Amino acid sequence: ENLYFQGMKKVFITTGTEHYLRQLMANYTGGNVTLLQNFSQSLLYQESTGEKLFQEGAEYRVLQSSGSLKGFGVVVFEYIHLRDEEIPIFLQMYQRASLHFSETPGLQSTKLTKAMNMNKFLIISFWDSEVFFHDWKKTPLSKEITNIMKKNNTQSGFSHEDIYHYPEF
């Protein structure tokens, strides 16, 4: 009924060594399970429906999703925190902005997600390459997200942006 609180579509994010994550992935199946990497670390992205069972990793409720994964490119994870007062307005603005996601060059898919039971949000975007993401940083939505992150960090916790790519063929 109120999917913000009760939605069952989830994203699980598990980080660790490549070896560990490849072992974990071989124990799972489906859910668009995707191994991603950057200079520092490896990460496993999985989508599923229902409550957590044995998924390792951080759990997020998918609030809004668009497009679909193509299986290549770079993946951006933007972590922010929002005050109660800011949530409805942010969700509205994001929904409005999303009507033009299909016009954003190089954008394959986006997920607006919420950390379970906390006012922490994770916006995940899948791009053909980093160039297209860099270009998108000129948009109002990107500037707002950047501003929230920076404001977050003058206060408590740690909001940040991580960029990953698909592993070597």
Side-chain angles (χ1 to χ4, degrees), residues 2-27 29-51 53-94 96-142 145-149 152-154 157-167 169:
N2 193 342
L3 300 175
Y4 176 89
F5 299 96
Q6 293 171 307
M8 296 310 294
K9 292 161 180 169
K10 310 296 176 62
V11 162
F12 287 89
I13 306 298
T14 313
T15 60
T17 65
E18 182 180 332
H19 184 251
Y20 182 85
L21 293 179
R22 287 189 177 279
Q23 291 183 305
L24 180 57
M25 218 185 329
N27 292 355
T29 182
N32 276 322
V33 177
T34 302
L35 179 67
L36 300 166
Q37 306 193 124
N38 62 22
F39 192 99
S40 305
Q41 211 181 27
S42 285
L43 170 162
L44 208 59
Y45 168 94
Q46 180 185 45
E47 293 161 1
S48 58
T49 296
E51 259 316 310
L53 286 179
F54 319 115
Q55 293 92 346
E56 309 189 9
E59 187 183 7
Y60 300 85
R61 175 179 303 107
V62 178
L63 299 181
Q64 309 183 31
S65 177
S66 67
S68 46
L69 278 53
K70 279 15 163 263
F72 68 82
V74 301
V75 187
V76 179
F77 299 77
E78 289 169 325
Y79 296 86
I80 61 168
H81 65 87
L82 292 175
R83 295 185 290 119
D84 288 339
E85 289 181 2
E86 299 177 296
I87 286 164
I89 291 274
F90 181 83
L91 297 177
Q92 186 183 241
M93 183 281 294
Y94 185 93
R96 288 284 286 156
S98 75
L99 300 170
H100 308 279
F101 288 169
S102 63
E103 303 170 335
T104 312
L107 184 52
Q108 298 175 9
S109 185
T110 64
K111 273 81 185 168
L112 171 58
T113 78
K114 182 191 174 301
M116 298 295 286
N117 316 320
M118 287 177 314
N119 280 27
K120 294 178 186 175
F121 298 80
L122 168 57
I123 304 161
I124 310 171
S125 52
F126 295 78
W127 302 88
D128 290 343
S129 83
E130 191 162 353
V131 178
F132 295 102
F133 169 63
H134 176 75
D135 292 338
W136 177 78
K137 287 195 168 295
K138 297 156 182 145
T139 63
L141 181 56
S142 178
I145 294 167
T146 300
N147 280 347
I148 291 162
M149 284 195 184
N152 284 171
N153 293 346
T154 62
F158 194 70
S159 295
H160 59 109
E161 177 174 280
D162 301 334
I163 304 177
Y164 289 80
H165 58 76
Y166 285 72
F169 180 85

